[PDB]
Structure formats: structure tokens, C-alpha cells
Assembly symmetry: C3
Homo-oligomer: 97 residues x 3
């Protein structure tokens, strides 16, 4: 039922779409691999960030300074993952058009 | 752990195969990512187990989200090996 | 849907900021990454090498951030020591080191083949 939340669907379908698009693109193996891997990683990192968010909320509702930092650090990881994804697709698909 | 031998075996084959530098890096990197995600998933589990042995909807949710990450990483590894080996023997 | 990006983006900055400000080891790691990203960008290589150079050091930062979050969770739960507390950080620290060794090896292989 974690899969059914209206956020993962949006994240997932975005990642899933790119994998499909990369699967159809006329690129060589190394490019196709890198295209898929970057989007997959984002999904991987987000899943890990959500898992951390679960552990924090598991402890309780009472806000602690460290509780917020873990979430921010986890969000930062996703941000970096998404940037790496955009840079990857840019560098590889640039001048491909 | 079994994975260390498994990772080695993956590295053995990667070095065994006659592939260029870029392809050889991609193969081993994909395998290493699985270890990293598994290690990170294992870390998350260790935390959850410590807080309480008792069941909580949030405790099981983290473990599920963590195991899915491992799955996706493994899927990514298979796709990588499939694609590159297909191209290599193409 | 548009707002979900903004909220998420704001957290990420707090994460990078807190990580930066609190540790010298992080800032120096951050600098090492940024220099690596820069060097790869101007380097005369093909796109696949450039991406591999960038991706690998990015991954170091990703795992570093993720492990840092796990550490924050452990420290949150209590001052108290624990075998499962040490285990969590031990596992998370291993992941960080693997990502770096890969990064070092990958960066070493690519510059070998390019300059040798
Ligand atoms: C449980 C088994 C799942 C993994 C093996 C079977 C399905 C995946 C096959 C390889 C990945 C498919 C995506 C790559 C693709 O579509 O382009 C094919 C092309 O790159 C071959 O050179
Ligand atoms: C010309 C270059 C094209 C660049 C393509 C950009 C998209 C490629 C990879 C990024 C995948 C992002 C999917 C994950 C995602 O954004 O969802 C998480 C986010 O909504 C959290 O707020
Ligand atoms: C508003 C809809 C947006 C859709 C997402 C963006 C679409 C991205 C690419 C569309 C073209 C697909 C690639 C087709 C192609 O390159 O052909 C591959 C080659 O095998 C042809 O022989
Ligand atoms: C994907 C859209 C998000 C915003 C776009 C901004 C992208 C930022 C950096 C991506 C670098 C793009 C240039 C890559 C490139 O191929 O350099 C040109 C070179 O190949 C000329 O042969
Ligand atoms: C041609 C033969 C080489 C094939 C290499 C394919 C690489 C696929 C996965 C790499 C990850 C290795 C670790 C596997 C693992 O952790 O599973 C262990 C667990 O499922 C046992 O219950
Ligand atoms: C030259 C500038 C860098 C080139 C790539 C630019 C990156 C483009 C878009 C990335 C920002 C998307 C924001 C998504 C986000 O907030 O991350 C979600 C995370 O923090 C929590 O899940
Ligand atoms: C393509 C993007 C490169 C990302 C590589 C990893 C970045 C790691 C650290 C950079 C985070 C920037 C935050 C800087 C910061 O917090 O300074 C604010 C504070 O010091 C004001 O005194
Ligand atoms: C303070 C944080 C700064 C973050 C900046 C984000 C980095 C954006 C793009 C990284 C550089 C990649 C572009 C490399 C490129 O296009 O050159 C390739 C070209 O020389 C091939 O002929």
C-alpha cells in the first residue's frame, strides 16, 4: 500500500516513462545503460529517503532537531540524484536530438 | 557473507570478458551499487529493530521501502549486464 | 503537484547547508566533488566517460548524505550506546567508503586510458 500513495505514482511513472523512452531511443549500449541507470538511481534514492522518513515518524510526533535533519539530508540526497539524472540525460542526449 | 564471493565472481567475469574500459566499469559499478543499497538497507533495518521489537505500521514500512530499493538496484544491475553483454556479443 | 517540488527543494537546501556548516570533513569532501565535476566537464573525453566521471563522485555525495541521515536518526533515538546503534553506523560507513573507492578507481581508470 506504500506503492498506492499519489506521490510514488507520480515519481514512479516519471521514472518508468524514462526507462521506456530510453529503451526505444537509438543509442548505443553504454548510453542506453547510463540513461536507464540515472533514472533508476533516483527511484532507488527516493525509496531510501522514504524509508528513513518512516523510521523518524516511527519514533513519534514530538519534533526533535535531529529528526528534521535526517529528512533534510535524505531530501538532499534525492536532489543530488535528480541533478545527476538531468546532467546525464543532457550530456548524452545533447547533439542527439 | 555470500555477497562478497558473488561480487568477486562478478568482478572475475568482468575482468575475464574482453571488454573495453568503459564497459568494464559499468558492469562492476552496477554490482557495487547493489552492495551499497543493501548495506544502507541493512543499516535502516538495524535502527528499526533497536527502537522496538514490537510491530508498528511505520517499522514494517521502512523495511519494505528499503527492500524495494535493493530490488530496483538488482533490476538495474541485470538490465545493465543484459544490455552490455548483448552488445558485446552482438 | 507543482508545490510538492518547492517543499521538497527547500528541505534539500537545509540538508546541504546543515551538512556543510557542521563538518569540515564534509566541506572538504564537497570541494573535492565540485572540483571533480569541474575537471570532467572541461576534459577532452566522450560523453560516456564524462558522465561516468561525474556520476561516480555524485554517488559519493549521495551515499554520504544518506548515511548522514541514518546517523542523525541513530543519534536522535538516544545518547545511549547500542550494538544495533554501532551496527547501523558501521553499515552506513561501509557504504560511504565503497562509493569513494569506486570513484577513485573509476577516475583512475578513465584518466589512464585517456592519457596513457
Ligand atoms: C526477470 C528478468 C528480467 C530481466 C531480463 C528480461 C527483461 C530485460 C531485458 C534487458 C533490459 C531491456 C531494456 C533494454 C532495451 O530495451 O534495449 C535493448 C537493446 O539495448 C539491446 O542491445
Ligand atoms: C535534454 C535532457 C533531458 C533530461 C530529462 C529529465 C528527466 C530525466 C531523469 C529525471 C527523473 C526524475 C523522476 C523522479 C522525480 O522527479 O520524482 C521525485 C520528485 O517528484 C520529488 O518531489
Ligand atoms: C508530450 C509528450 C512527451 C513525451 C516524452 C518525450 C518524448 C521523447 C522522445 C520521443 C521519440 C522517441 C524516440 C524514437 C527514436 O529515436 O527511434 C529509435 C530508432 O530505433 C528508430 O529506428
Ligand atoms: C534538461 C532541462 C533542464 C535544464 C537544462 C540545463 C542543463 C544544464 C547542464 C547540461 C549540459 C548541457 C550541454 C551538454 C553538451 O553536450 O555540451 C555541448 C557539447 O556536446 C558540444 O558538442
Ligand atoms: C554472466 C554471469 C554474471 C551475472 C551477473 C549479474 C549481476 C546480478 C546481480 C548482482 C548482485 C550480486 C548480489 C546478489 C544478492 O545480493 O542476492 C543474494 C540473495 O538474493 C540470496 O538470498
Ligand atoms: C546547471 C544547473 C544544474 C543542472 C541540472 C539542474 C537540475 C534541475 C532540476 C532539479 C531540481 C528538482 C527539485 C526536486 C527536489 O526538490 O528533490 C526532492 C527531494 O529534495 C525530496 O524528495
Ligand atoms: C552538480 C551539483 C554539484 C553537487 C556536488 C555536491 C555538493 C556538496 C555541497 C554543496 C552544498 C552547497 C551549500 C553551501 C552552504 O551551505 O553555504 C551556506 C553557508 O555556508 C553560508 O555561510
Ligand atoms: C555551486 C553548485 C554548482 C552546480 C553546477 C551544476 C553543474 C552543471 C553542469 C556540469 C557540467 C557538465 C557539462 C559538460 C559539457 O557540456 O561539456 C561537454 C563538451 O565539452 C563535449 O564536447
Amino acid at each position: 500500500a506504500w506503492i498506492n500513495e499519489a506521490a510514488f505514482r507520480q515519481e514512479g511513472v516519471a521514472v518508468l516513462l524514462c526507462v521506456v523512452i530510453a529503451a526505444w531511443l537509438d543509442v548505443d549500449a553504454v548510453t542506453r545503460v547510463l540513461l536507464i541507470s540515472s533514472v533508476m538511481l533516483v527511484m532507488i534514492v527516493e525509496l531510501l529517503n522514504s524509508a528513513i522518513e518512516a523510521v523518524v515518524d516511527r519514533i513519534g510526533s514530538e519534533y526533535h532537531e535531529l529528526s528534521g535533519r535526517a529528512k533534510d539530508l535524505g531530501s538532499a540526497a534525492v536532489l543530488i540524484a535528480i541533478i545527476d539524472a538531468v546532467i546525464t540525460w543532457a550530456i548524452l542526449l545533447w547533439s542527439h536530438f
